[PDB]
Design a protein around this ligand. Sequence first.
Ligand code: GSH
Ligand code: GSH
Length: 158
Amino acid sequence: KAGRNMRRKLFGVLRLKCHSLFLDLQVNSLQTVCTNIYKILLLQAYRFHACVLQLPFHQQVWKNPTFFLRVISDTASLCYSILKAKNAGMSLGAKGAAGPLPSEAVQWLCHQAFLLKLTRHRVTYVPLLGSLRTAQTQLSRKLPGTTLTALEAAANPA
Ligand SMILES: N[C@@H](CCC(=O)N[C@@H](CS)C(=O)NCC(=O)O)C(=O)O
Ligand SMILES: N[C@@H](CCC(=O)N[C@@H](CS)C(=O)NCC(=O)O)C(=O)O
């Protein structure tokens, strides 16, 4: 427990730096880009949960659920902005895909990563799991680009 916390704290910045180097669809496969942005978002979800555990006892999650959901949304926006900048010089012969990832896909990966972590602590996060679970289908009805299952593949490896 104290060993896991030490490892997350120690490797946080380095892991994020490393993942950020594999987001360029010009040189990387789409599967790689999706996996690495997802691993970034999952890392962020763990940091999120750590930060929530140290909120005052009266600052319950059901008390201000807009705050937490917006934090989650802002995470997707920020990772998406990073991804955009990293893919700015993309050309027609890019290895990754014909299309650089829409914000819908980064959003989907974000909600996925947060759900996986937040379902482990339902007693704390039952107010949020409602809105996030719909957003998944809200986005799954917004864009089933087939590649939706290629996103599910990136959220799968252990
Ligand atoms: N992410 C690289 C491989 C490099 C690698 O494995 N190093 C980092 C990820 S950038 C790491 O922390 N290892 C994998 C993990 O622990 O999830 C790739 O997809 O080809
Ligand atoms: N502690 C985070 C790593 C991120 C981090 O280093 N930031 C804060 C977390 S709010 C920190 O300095 N750690 C103090 C703590 O959680 O005891 C984690 O468990 O993943």
